[PDB]
Amino acid sequence: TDLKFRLVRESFADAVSWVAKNLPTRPAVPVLSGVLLTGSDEGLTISGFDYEVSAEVRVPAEIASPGTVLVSGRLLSDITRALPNKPVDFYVDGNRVALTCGNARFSLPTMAVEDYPTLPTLPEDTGTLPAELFSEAIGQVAIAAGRDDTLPMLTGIRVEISGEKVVLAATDRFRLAVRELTWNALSPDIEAAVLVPAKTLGEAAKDGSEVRLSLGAGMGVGKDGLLGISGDGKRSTTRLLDAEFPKFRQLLPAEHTAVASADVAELTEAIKLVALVADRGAQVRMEFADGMLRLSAGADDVGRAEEDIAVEFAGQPLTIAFNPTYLIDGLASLHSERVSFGFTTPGKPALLRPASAEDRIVDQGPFAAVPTDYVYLLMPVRLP
């Protein structure tokens, strides 16, 4: 039977575009540029394969005749996004698709359905959490992932699950981001950790109700090599990374010789200003003391810059330098009005954690690490 259906343009366009986003922009063979459209029982399923991410969406549709067809996904996405706001009629006539909408008509070639690779089956459901929480947590840690395929152990986001407790972590050896959250597990005895390619999972974090993650059940979590993500009539699978995440928990300092807090916007603006004279944007210097932070950069040849802002500060004064891009990345990932810093020495990692404007800093130390759902640990750079 030849597929023939009608549905509202906005629904078609959103569904197709969501599946087509993952297709290669330079597919090796035409079949890999395709999306599969399958119509049956008052619904249209749109499916897309890619070696790393596969995806599938079902939307309601008036199905005049059931069937399946394979056509170019990106092209179909571009067309449906630009069609008139009229019902879209779609019928397959032999090896060609006739798409009609208001005063517009398209005739598209089809490809061999039997040559499209099979989409992987979603693993058993593992647990659920709000879409908003999931996208935020991923966005927070994804900024710290490496982006160099030659160091694949850095290109992932680690997902640890211990019952109701989920930990996400990422590092590129210069910053480490760790986000803890609680979710609703769907089976007992879940105690596992997997590694998901960061670029994939990060971009996918961009509205919904609840998201369902499917990595298996019980002791089987992680065994299928896939992370399923579902919600709102959409499902996707992401292939897991075979690399091994570094042993990051021994990096987390339990005690600080100094703590500080600053307004995130003020500090961000000050870093951007002084970094204007930093060579290659390589470093900015933070001198902490006396409820003041002296932020400086530059050198004699190109110019020197300083800006002093008010901070809360306790413990041993120190001067410590950072990559200003990595510093701003960390400040922007806190998602809070203020930042709390924890320091040991100018040559050892600095701990950044969210603080609200209703938090306040104190004795003169030493200071136990404060429990926090999010940490961004940043290696300093050497002072000149």
Partner: peptide, 10 residues
Amino acid sequence: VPTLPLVPXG
């Protein structure tokens, strides 16, 4: 430009 004291890793 030192790395985090990841072991191994640096």
